[PDB]
Amino acid sequence: TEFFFHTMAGREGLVDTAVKTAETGYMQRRLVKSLEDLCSQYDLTVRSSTGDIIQFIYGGDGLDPAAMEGKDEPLEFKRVLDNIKAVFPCPSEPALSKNELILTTESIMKKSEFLCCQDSFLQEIKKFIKGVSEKIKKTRDKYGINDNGTTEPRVLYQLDRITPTQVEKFLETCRDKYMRAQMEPGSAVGALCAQSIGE
Amino acid sequence: DDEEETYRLWKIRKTIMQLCHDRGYLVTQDELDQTLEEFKAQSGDKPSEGRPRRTDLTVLVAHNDDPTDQMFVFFPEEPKVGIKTIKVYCQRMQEENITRALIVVQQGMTPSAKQSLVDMAPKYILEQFLQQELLINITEHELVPEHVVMTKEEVTELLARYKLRENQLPRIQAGDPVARYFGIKRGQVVKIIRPSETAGRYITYRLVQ
Amino acid sequence: TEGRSRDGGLRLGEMERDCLIGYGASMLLLERLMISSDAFEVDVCGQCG
Amino acid sequence: KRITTPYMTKYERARVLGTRALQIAMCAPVMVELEGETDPLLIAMKELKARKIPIIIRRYLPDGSYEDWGVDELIITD
Amino acid sequence: KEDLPKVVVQGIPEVSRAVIHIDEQSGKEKYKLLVEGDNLRAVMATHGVKGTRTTSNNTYEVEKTLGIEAARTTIINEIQYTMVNHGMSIDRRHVMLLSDLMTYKGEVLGITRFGLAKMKESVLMLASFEKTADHLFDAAYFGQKDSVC
Ligand SMILES: [Zn+2]
8 A cells, every 4th residue: 555655656756857847948948049149248238139228237236146255245254354364374463453454444445446446345345344343342342452562461462363464465355356256248148047047 | 974085085185296296396395294184174074075176286386497387186076087078177277278287087087088188289288097096106115216307418418428329228118107107208218226235226227108 | 961870970959059159159159050060152143132 | 548348358368369279270470489389279378378469359349439459468367 | 686696895896815914923923914816006095004015926917006117126026036935046147137138128028929029120030939931921021121130
């Protein structure tokens, strides 16, 4: 009895495999047969073969999904900061307070090359660095860590140790990654979208 | 009786007057902050006063730029508006020399009257609606962004930027609710302000047909 | 020709002409589909068409 | 002033390498020195790394305007 | 006598059923109303309902009642919601593109033989897809030129 019931369920599961793929095939063909033409241009609009605009900016941001390290997002700043910390553990540089952090970053971000960046990204990194500044404040407060650099248990400074060279490296690498996540003009967005919806 | 009906009349006044305000024509905040009870104080009662002209408005002059442009607001009490009523309100509009007239009907329009409402007078516009549509203002809904009508200079700037010809834009059609909401004549462009998962507002432009 | 029984080589259905576009390659598609397979030359008259 | 991106895209890399390989396959002049190489495409990638290729890409905008960029002058990366 | 009992007396003629769904999460242990029916305009014709926060799953309904922009957002929303409802991931840019394509013409044009005719113009790709002979003969009738584009 159980054997027969179990086989009745097994064949039931079996029979759907090919039919689902038939319906998948007549999704695939009719989609790509309509959407394959769309191309992304050097001005960053998306235009039909007749040249008429469809999207003024592709994807609202001009960024290829193939670059997103985060959830549809190009970066995870926690990970990046940890990585940069590990590779360059310079012991000579001093530690910085919230004031030093903010003045150092402001000293750098004002550079024009950053101003060539999407303002939104700059504001977001501002928020990230502001949050870490607040946390380092919390830590030094909870351990009353002297900014003068004079306390005996030197270990106390290792808690949230960061250095200006590290700030420079982190910011420049963030710029690099963001810049290289852009979609390249000439790519066939329509075909990739079609296959992404189909598979 | 028909407490809901009185509430509906209150709400149609509220919403129509908010619409006309948004369209730039003469409205004042003290009017905007009217209350249902205050409206009760103004009006009579559903059985005592009825559907006819009791609290409707025609003060809606083009306070925005030139009050000489003005709208009527008419409340034909008959469930179905016939061509003869169209003539009655046509001579109302002509006598008053008013350029616009917002019409609301209870249960719709006759074919002759429906036909006339596209050819009555090129000089005049008599936008038609039913009370049901006006019970809510579509602008308040979550599922729609804000919009703006763009002046020819701004249109020129945009089409210069990307070097387009207006026919190359995305389209919007005259029959869309928002299009009627603002009475946008075809051959124009409106800016769309799309919200986003982030503060970055998505801005985009669309041509009316 | 058709296949192994009669010396036909391979078939490259629509669903690979799709992936070639996916990558975006153009000279590969042009070659694979008209140069190598069955290229031919014809003559037309401009005046009448 | 030029507006297009200063980096070279995948597609430009592909086509420039392809066409220069076609050229080099024939007896066209060559500039980078060769260590017993025999394949055209390897000569092509050597030169591209050396930025020796005699080509200018003429990018086209949709409206008929255009820019020019020197292959020796774009930003290149692996 | 057999006909009269069927007649409507009260309620929405077009509504089939509704239900008060109830929730329990800490944020709020409250109630919410779910409806089946194909007149979104009708329900917002009522007092009590927070009509500004309504929604109809049907694309045509939202298009009819709120306009094309709401229809577009609903298309993207529904594709993504159904996909995650199963458990798939798909980058939102793809689905955003596909959303806009359907509506750039000022109307929702589905991916159908009818939509395709209303969306493309060249001849061969019509003739390749479906209704070939019809398209061919009508094209010869019109004397259409066709660019290789
Ligand atoms: Zn001839």
